[PDB]
Amino acid sequence: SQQVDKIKASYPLFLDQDYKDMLAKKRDGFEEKYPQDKIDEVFQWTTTKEYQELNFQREALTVNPAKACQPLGAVLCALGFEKTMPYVHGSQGCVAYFRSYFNRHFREPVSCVSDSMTEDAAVFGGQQNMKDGLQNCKATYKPDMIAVSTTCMAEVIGDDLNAFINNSKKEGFIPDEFPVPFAHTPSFVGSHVTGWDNMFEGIARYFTLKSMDDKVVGSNKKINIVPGFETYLGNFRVIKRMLSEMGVGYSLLSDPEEVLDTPADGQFRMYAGGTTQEEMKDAPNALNTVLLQPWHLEKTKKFVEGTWKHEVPKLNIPMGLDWTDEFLMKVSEISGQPIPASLTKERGRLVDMMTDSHTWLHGKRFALWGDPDFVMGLVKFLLELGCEPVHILCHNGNKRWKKAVDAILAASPYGKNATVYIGKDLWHLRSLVFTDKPDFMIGNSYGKFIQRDTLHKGKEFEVPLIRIGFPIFDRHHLHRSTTLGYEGAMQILTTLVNSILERLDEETRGMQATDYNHDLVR
Amino acid sequence: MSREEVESLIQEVLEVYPEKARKDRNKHLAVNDPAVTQSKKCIISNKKSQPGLMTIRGCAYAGSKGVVWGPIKDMIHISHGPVGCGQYSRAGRRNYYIGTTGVNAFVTMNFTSDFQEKDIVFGGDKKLAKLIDEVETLFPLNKGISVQSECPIGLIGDDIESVSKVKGAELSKTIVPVRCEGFRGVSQSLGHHIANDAVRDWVLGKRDEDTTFASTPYDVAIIGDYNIGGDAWSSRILLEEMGLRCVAQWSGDGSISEIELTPKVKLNLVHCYRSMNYISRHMEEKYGIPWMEYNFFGPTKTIESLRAIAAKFDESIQKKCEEVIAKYKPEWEAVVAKYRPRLEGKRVMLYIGGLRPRHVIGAYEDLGMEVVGTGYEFAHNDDYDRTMKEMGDSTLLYDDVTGYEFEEFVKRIKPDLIGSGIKEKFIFQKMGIPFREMHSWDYSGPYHGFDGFAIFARDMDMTLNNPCWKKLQAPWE
Amino acid sequence: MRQCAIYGKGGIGKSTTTQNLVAALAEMGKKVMIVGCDPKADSTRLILHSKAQNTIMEMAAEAGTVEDLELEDVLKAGYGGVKCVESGGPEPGVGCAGRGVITAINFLEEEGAYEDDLDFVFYDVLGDVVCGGFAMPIRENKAQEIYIVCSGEMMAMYAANNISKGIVKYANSGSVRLGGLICNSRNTDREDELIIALANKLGTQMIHFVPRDNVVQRAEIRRMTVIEYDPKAKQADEYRALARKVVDNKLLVIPNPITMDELEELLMEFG
Amino acid sequence: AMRQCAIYGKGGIGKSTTTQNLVAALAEMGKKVMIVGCDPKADSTRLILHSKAQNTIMEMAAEAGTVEDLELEDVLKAGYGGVKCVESGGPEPGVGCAGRGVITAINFLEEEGAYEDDLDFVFYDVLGDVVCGGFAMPIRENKAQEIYIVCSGEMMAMYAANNISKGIVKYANSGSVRLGGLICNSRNTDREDELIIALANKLGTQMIHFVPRDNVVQRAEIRRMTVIEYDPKAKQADEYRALARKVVDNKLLVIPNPITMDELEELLMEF
Numbered sequence A: 001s002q003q004v005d006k007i008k009a010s011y012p013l014f015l016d017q018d019y020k021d022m023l024a025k026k027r028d029g030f031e032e033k034y035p036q037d038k039i040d041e042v043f044q045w046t047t048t049k050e051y052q053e054l055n056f057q058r059e060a061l062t063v064n065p066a067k068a069c070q071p072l073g074a075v076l077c078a079l080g081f082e083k084t085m086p087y088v089h090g091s092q093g094c095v096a097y098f099r100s101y102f103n104r105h106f107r108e109p110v111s112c113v114s115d116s117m118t119e120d121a122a123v124f125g126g127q128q129n130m131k132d133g134l135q136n137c138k139a140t141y142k143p144d145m146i147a148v149s150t151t152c153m154a155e156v157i158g159d160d161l162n163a164f165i166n167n168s169k170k171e172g173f174i175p176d177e178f179p180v181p182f183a184h185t186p187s188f189v190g191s192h193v194t195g196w197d198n199m200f201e202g203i204a205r206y207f208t209l210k211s212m213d214d215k216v217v218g219s220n221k222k223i224n225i226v227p228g229f230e231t232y233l234g235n236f237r238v239i240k241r242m243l244s245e246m247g248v249g250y251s252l253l254s255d256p257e258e259v260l261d262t263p264a265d266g267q268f269r270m271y272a273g274g275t276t277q278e279e280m281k282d283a284p285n286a287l288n289t290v291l292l293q294p295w296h297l298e299k300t301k302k303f304v305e306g307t308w309k310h311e312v313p314k315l316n317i318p319m320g321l322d323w324t325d326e327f328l329m330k331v332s333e334i335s336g337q338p339i340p341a342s343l344t345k346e347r348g349r350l351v352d353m354m355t356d357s358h359t360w361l362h363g364k365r366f367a368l369w370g371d372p373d374f375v376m377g378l379v380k381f382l383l384e385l386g387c388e389p390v391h392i393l394c395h396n397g398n399k400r401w402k403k404a405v406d407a408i409l410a411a412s413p414y415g416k417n418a419t420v421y422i423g424k425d426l427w428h429l430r431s432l433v434f435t436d437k438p439d440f441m442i443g444n445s446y447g448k449f450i451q452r453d454t455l456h457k458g459k460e461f462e463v464p465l466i467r468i469g470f471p472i473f474d475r476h477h478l479h480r481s482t483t484l485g486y487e488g489a490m491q492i493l494t495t496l497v498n499s500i501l502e503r504l505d506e507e508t509r510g511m512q513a514t515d516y517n518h519d520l521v522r
Numbered sequence B: 001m002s003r004e005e006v007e008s009l010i011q012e013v014l015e016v017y018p019e020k021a022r023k024d025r026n027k028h029l030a031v032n033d034p035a036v037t038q039s040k041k042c043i044i045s046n047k048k049s050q051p052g053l054m055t056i057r058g059c060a061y062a063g064s065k066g067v068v069w070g071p072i073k074d075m076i077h078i079s080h081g082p083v084g085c086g087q088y089s090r091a092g093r094r095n096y097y098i099g100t101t102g103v104n105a106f107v108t109m110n111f112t113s114d115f116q117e118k119d120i121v122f123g124g125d126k127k128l129a130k131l132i133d134e135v136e137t138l139f140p141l142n143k144g145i146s147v148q149s150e151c152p153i154g155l156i157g158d159d160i161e162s163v164s165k166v167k168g169a170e171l172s173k174t175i176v177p178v179r180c181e182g183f184r185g186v187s188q189s190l191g192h193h194i195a196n197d198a199v200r201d202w203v204l205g206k207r208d209e210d211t212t213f214a215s216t217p218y219d220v221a222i223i224g225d226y227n228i229g230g231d232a233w234s235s236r237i238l239l240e241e242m243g244l245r246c247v248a249q250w251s252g253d254g255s256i257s258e259i260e261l262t263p264k265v266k267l268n269l270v271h272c273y274r275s276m277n278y279i280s281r282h283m284e285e286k287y288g289i290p291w292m293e294y295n296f297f298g299p300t301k302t303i304e305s306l307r308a309i310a311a312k313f314d315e316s317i318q319k320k321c322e323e324v325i326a327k328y329k330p331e332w333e334a335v336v337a338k339y340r341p342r343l344e345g346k347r348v349m350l351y352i353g354g355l356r357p358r359h360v361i362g363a364y365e366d367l368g369m370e371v372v373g374t375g376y377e378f379a380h381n382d383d384y385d386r387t388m389k390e391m392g393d394s395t396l397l398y399d400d401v402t403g404y405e406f407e408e409f410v411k412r413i414k415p416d417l418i419g420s421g422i423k424e425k426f427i428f429q430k431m432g433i434p435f436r437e438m439h440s441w442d443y444s445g446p447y448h449g450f451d452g453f454a455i456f457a458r459d460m461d462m463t464l465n466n467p468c469w470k471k472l473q474a475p476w477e
Numbered sequence C: 001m002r003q004c005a006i007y008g009k010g011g012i013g014k015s016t017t018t019q020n021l022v023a024a025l026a027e028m029g030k031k032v033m034i035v036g037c038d039p040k041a042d043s044t045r046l047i048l049h050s051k052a053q054n055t056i057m058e059m060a061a062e063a064g065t066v067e068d069l070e071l072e073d074v075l076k077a078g079y080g081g082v083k084c085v086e087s088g089g090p091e092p093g094v095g096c097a098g099r100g101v102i103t104a105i106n107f108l109e110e111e112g113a114y115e116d117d118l119d120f121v122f123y124d125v126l127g128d129v130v131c132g133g134f135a136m137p138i139r140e141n142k143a144q145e146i147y148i149v150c151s152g153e154m155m156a157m158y159a160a161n162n163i164s165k166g167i168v169k170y171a172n173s174g175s176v177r178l179g180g181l182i183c184n185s186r187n188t189d190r191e192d193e194l195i196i197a198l199a200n201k202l203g204t205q206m207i208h209f210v211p212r213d214n215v216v217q218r219a220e221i222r223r224m225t226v227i228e229y230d231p232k233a234k235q236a237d238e239y240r241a242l243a244r245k246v247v248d249n250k251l252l253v254i255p256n257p258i259t260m261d262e263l264e265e266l267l268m269e270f271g
Numbered sequence D: 001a002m003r004q005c006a007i008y009g010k011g012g013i014g015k016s017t018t019t020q021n022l023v024a025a026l027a028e029m030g031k032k033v034m035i036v037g038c039d040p041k042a043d044s045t046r047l048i049l050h051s052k053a054q055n056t057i058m059e060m061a062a063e064a065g066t067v068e069d070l071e072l073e074d075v076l077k078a079g080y081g082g083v084k085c086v087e088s089g090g091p092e093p094g095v096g097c098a099g100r101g102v103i104t105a106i107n108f109l110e111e112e113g114a115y116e117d118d119l120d121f122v123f124y125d126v127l128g129d130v131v132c133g134g135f136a137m138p139i140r141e142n143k144a145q146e147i148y149i150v151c152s153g154e155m156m157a158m159y160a161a162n163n164i165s166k167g168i169v170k171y172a173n174s175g176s177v178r179l180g181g182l183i184c185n186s187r188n189t190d191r192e193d194e195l196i197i198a199l200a201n202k203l204g205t206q207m208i209h210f211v212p213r214d215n216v217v218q219r220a221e222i223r224r225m226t227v228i229e230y231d232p233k234a235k236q237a238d239e240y241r242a243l244a245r246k247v248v249d250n251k252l253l254v255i256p257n258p259i260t261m262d263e264l265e266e267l268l269m270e271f
């Protein structure tokens, strides 16, 4: 039953007596469900340490992974170039899933196409599909450049992207001068960050490997910045703002913030901003190339050093005090532009926010997961805040990144009780937070189920989730925040301290029971 | 618009394609004529999508795993292959259920084999057997395992049938191998067909000899409702208030026991014909169980469906149906009185998957709004045959429409509301046209039944008459 | 209905011998079916009078999808009423022939080409067999008897034992069995004794000793099989004897794979 | 001079053996020739390294877990005359995907750096049944630019050569890979030499060398020592030196064009 003046959605409509009675009747009559005591016993067993040993003895089953496949990152990289259409050679379901994923994270239109390869195309090859798809995309959506990625189906059968595109140009389906960079993005190797790296490397090769005869390092007096797989527009904005404040000429390659923040003014803009083709053609002339997320830009680093002859600095991600200062100093040394007073004032303000909030941030135990560079930057920032990481998880990390994070932890007294995991999933993290309980979890929206499980065990075992990462689906407009630089550090610090204070306020709201600590001033 | 103008718009839109693309797409656009009972003479459906035209269709893996097998809660569904698919399809569909996730329910969970290069080169049979062993070790309360094959599995010829058979025989478990590779077919419809075949072969006939279940002459099964925010529950409360006993729900909030008990029912109530027509026909042919289509979208369709269902039974069922209709009349009458004045005369354009483009027209007409254009992602010619009757004169019908085609069709029609998926929501929101997600109900619902009608009316009113749509133009421009 | 699979290497005479075998078998009054898992389409080129036929996958592509293809468009009669089909596939160097044979076999299973009104079904597979697509013919509800065609060369033994090792997994999982070894003589020194020893180690039975000649090539130039090019030659009688003995064969034994040191020893005792 | 070549043809004609003795003859007077084995059977490097098997790329990738953490020297080894050897490897027959293995092994070799030293020859060895792009990777861009087809005088060799020439049209019209010549491995066929030169001029090319069906090769294979290793003074040694000379001083390479079937039908009548 519904009252028209107060209409109920599914919650709390299905909490009514008739719906509850019908649910119970259906369950008892036909569901053949296990008894509730057995369910409680199994849940309690899953919260134990023997279950943790069984979970960590896994070898072939992955439960709730924390990574995606390469073509997603390839599409995100292709979106950052001017009037560029991300083209995925393979099946249409992959493109649909990519578009749904990015629509849910960014709440923005995401343009991506496919050749819709079928069984006959899987058997005879995708030459005709490539030709017709390139022709149709160019005719219909009129882009200035088409960046080709691959699905696993094409990679398994060994589609020759170079030969296919060359034959497409040779038979007149596309103009011979039309830029069609391509990259191999096998989904069974690496993850989405590897796809971003592969796509950027392919585009850079396409515009710069055949025209290195008339290139001189430092001709244009600029610094190239490669941001990598980034889902926060604030990071692009803050890097550009900092480099403009320092008065440093920069060429940020693969900048997608404009197409992911289009205004709503009555017209739909498929393309907006993006790195221009002239910028990438003039890329080798820069003084140096700086990689913001080096731990998933290895192929790009190798190509840049081998072809552009750029001495890429050994810099960490500009996360936190120490690494932001290192980044600024390296930029100042490369360009010769001194660090101005505005950045010094920003650093001083950030140190004063750290001083203000250190009394609440100290000693807190955190579990975190995400991308390698992002995770290591978050761990470093937590170490500068006096916090104690306990469980560090990176599903797409390797042994070298784990060694670097271990060295970072050993360099600090707050990393004594910290362990790093690579190749594990979120089920392992749930087992960890049940056995070795941290105060908070920092991750993407997939940790809300872990929070649900911990709450189901009890209010004293609940591990609240702090949403910093990709993808975030259950909150709105969090992609507009900033992670890099001093501004991102202030944002993260404010989020952390306010989360701690909100949890404390929740724990002390009981009247005549726990309200003696419901202080007005915190 | 006049009929001569819809054709002109169609031609002007098609003028940009190359010759082959234009010739192919000219067969997928039609002007509706309710007199014609054969949709083949006007529109062409169920063909491959043109390459590079930004289609909205999915794959067979979606149509099986995320549609049919996924809503089943007591089973564990393995995304056999690379990670992507499982990750992109995890908890994206709001097939609601009741259970303890991680113990006895696994709908929102993602189980995957996470194939690597060595798995492709050397195979995945041993890895699949080890994965099944670990699934049984770590999740003892599951009532079955399903193996959803992603593309590479089909390509490299991994034999999951034998692995499933051996592991099920040795572990006494129901392990259902599904060949739902994405490159098969053209869209999710073949995924529906493959999942239905798997249900028929490996699950449906398990209790063919068990006679312990006592059957009443008022036994029904809801077929093809997936509980998108509680729609299956809303329909079930109406069906049970009629004196009818629902034994099975396919597959929203469904359990493997309900699937096993289905062949004992007296009537199959099919909501989504497109997804479960094959299994309905198989049950009719093998067990003699009749099936019928019912629609619970809006008060008129709901009342007609309740009367049609009650017509299949004795006089007590009809009396209870009359009692339910009389009880629920004032509520939906009040909802209409509240929300029809705010929504009268508004024009709606729809683009949804296989069933909802024609099922939701009744509610929009109940609220006083008209549908100027509907379209299907993957529906066959029978769905369009049913669609011509429900749509008015000189209304546009499109199949496998592209983003370009939909954009300019909306630009030339200027509909008051657009109901489609997440891949067009922001495109049409930035154009200044109110948009409603017709797949997930915009994280609201349910919309089925008398209870869902109020939520539907409230949602349409709040989206259409929001003050934000009048603010897209800066005063200085 | 008996479903048989012919394995070996390319160029030994897998197809050739299979085609004359089934032609002779049809001459005795057996309804036989040849399913060509060779993407080169050369397994039915002596029974069908068509030069290139109308392959399963080529018409699946011409019809849009496989589901739109009917059985009658690809299943055509040959000499002696022999039903035959061709899986088809891509040109060399592109695509995936394994998916081609998988799709063709699933298509045949879908529309019931095994109508229970036939006697024998012979699968002509690729020699390389480097993926599961070409191992599909030896799965459950598929060919049960495997006849490995070998030649006098030592790499013929190597491929035979590697193929047997591959069969081992399906024999253990399913019920497929190694039937025997059709050894095609290459006019080498006392090869028959070595092949007998290899069969004894494998536990199987050597099938027959069809020799190397020229009438088979002159019958091919006529574009039909050996038996009905000149029903009289000795080779035709040997092929008919082969048909009779594979009709009355009943010994099915799991292969026992040997190491390369073992194979070196068999080369040693007969240099 | 960084000359990347590849051997094609159907299995049984002797592509592997031919390239093993070819590299052995090349290695006499100072070649830094490296050979790549794109055969899942793991025999393309057998005689040069004098060991039946070694650490193939896929085996070590499976042992370590990933190709990134796999060393170059763990799979690449040097043998006679500094012939640096490496082999792709793959799965046991009937399972997996060997083409993907060839693809990842070739990418491994290319991106660690193997085309850096003198590398007088980068000879590739492929299998007869090229059924996917994985086995067409050796003829991709920045790869082998000179393809040799090993063939004999016999219908099946002509069919294989025609199909391969068809397959080297797609990769040649959009690249720099051409066809070098046709290598002959005699089957002891009648007036063959004239037939083979007829084929060579039919494709507008020339035949490099004719290798008789000598019994020395089968004796050298059992002792797994190539004829150059066997003895530096044999008849085949001089013949393989002639092969080496005419393969290093080759200058003829034209885009292949498929020819019609009527010549295949009536070749025997002419000869």
Ligand SMILES: Nc1ncnc2c1ncn2[C@@H]1O[C@H](COP(=O)(O)OP(=O)(O)OP(=O)(O)O)[C@@H](O)[C@H]1O
Pocket (backbone or CB within 6 Å): C009, C153, C154, C155, D009, D010, D011, D012, D013, D014, D015, D016, D017, D018, D039, D041, D126, D127, D128, D185, D186, D211, D212, D213, D214, D215, D217, D218, D221
């Ligand atoms: N000139 C020759 N005279 C006689 N026998 C030869 C000659 N060259 C090679 N052989 C032998 O012929 C056989 C050739 O088989 P081989 O495995 O080399 O062929 P292949 O083309 O590499 O086959 P696949 O592609 O199936 O691996 C071997 O027994 C080899 O020793």
Ligand SMILES: Nc1ncnc2c1ncn2[C@@H]1O[C@H](COP(=O)(O)OP(=O)(O)O)[C@@H](O)[C@H]1O
Pocket (backbone or CB within 6 Å): C009, C010, C011, C012, C013, C014, C015, C016, C017, C127, C184, C185, C210, C211, C212, C213, C214, C216, C217, C220, D154, D155, D156
């Ligand atoms: N018994 C035989 N004696 C001589 N030549 C034969 C004999 N059997 C087959 N051949 C020839 O051997 C060649 C290869 O046989 P075929 O079956 O076409 O190869 P594959 O083993 O690859 O299927 C053909 O030219 C065929 O005529």
Ligand code: ICS
Pocket (backbone or CB within 6 Å): B063, B067, B093, B188, B226, B228, B272, B274, B275, B352, B353, B354, B355, B356, B357, B377, B438, B439, B440
């Ligand atoms: S199953 Fe189908 S696309 Fe019938 S794949 Fe799709 S929950 Fe749609 S129009 Mo999403 S044939 Fe259901 C559907 Fe309809 S996921 Fe839902 S809304 S009634």
Ligand code: CLF
Pocket (backbone or CB within 6 Å): A069, A071, A091, A092, A093, A094, A095, A097, A150, A151, A152, A153, A187, B059, B060, B061, B062, B082, B083, B084, B085, B086, B088, B149, B150, B151, B180, B181, B182, B183
């Ligand atoms: S059409 Fe469908 S969604 Fe596509 S792969 Fe195929 S079953 Fe799956 Fe999967 S991991 Fe990613 S998303 Fe693909 S590239 Fe492969």
Ligand code: SF4
Pocket (backbone or CB within 6 Å): A156, A157, A158, B155, B156, B157, C095, C096, C097, C098, C099, C130, C131, C132, C133, D096, D097, D098, D099, D100, D131, D132, D133, D134
């Ligand atoms: S090896 Fe087999 S499965 Fe793999 S691509 Fe080639 S034909 Fe297809």
Ligand SMILES: [Fe+3]
Pocket (backbone or CB within 6 Å): A106, A107, A108, A109, B426
């Ligand atoms: Fe938005």
Ligand SMILES: [Mg+2]
Pocket (backbone or CB within 6 Å): C010, C014, C015, C038, C042, C124, C125
């Ligand atoms: Mg053959």
Ligand SMILES: [Mg+2]
Pocket (backbone or CB within 6 Å): D015, D016, D017, D039, D044, D125, D126, D127
């Ligand atoms: Mg070889």
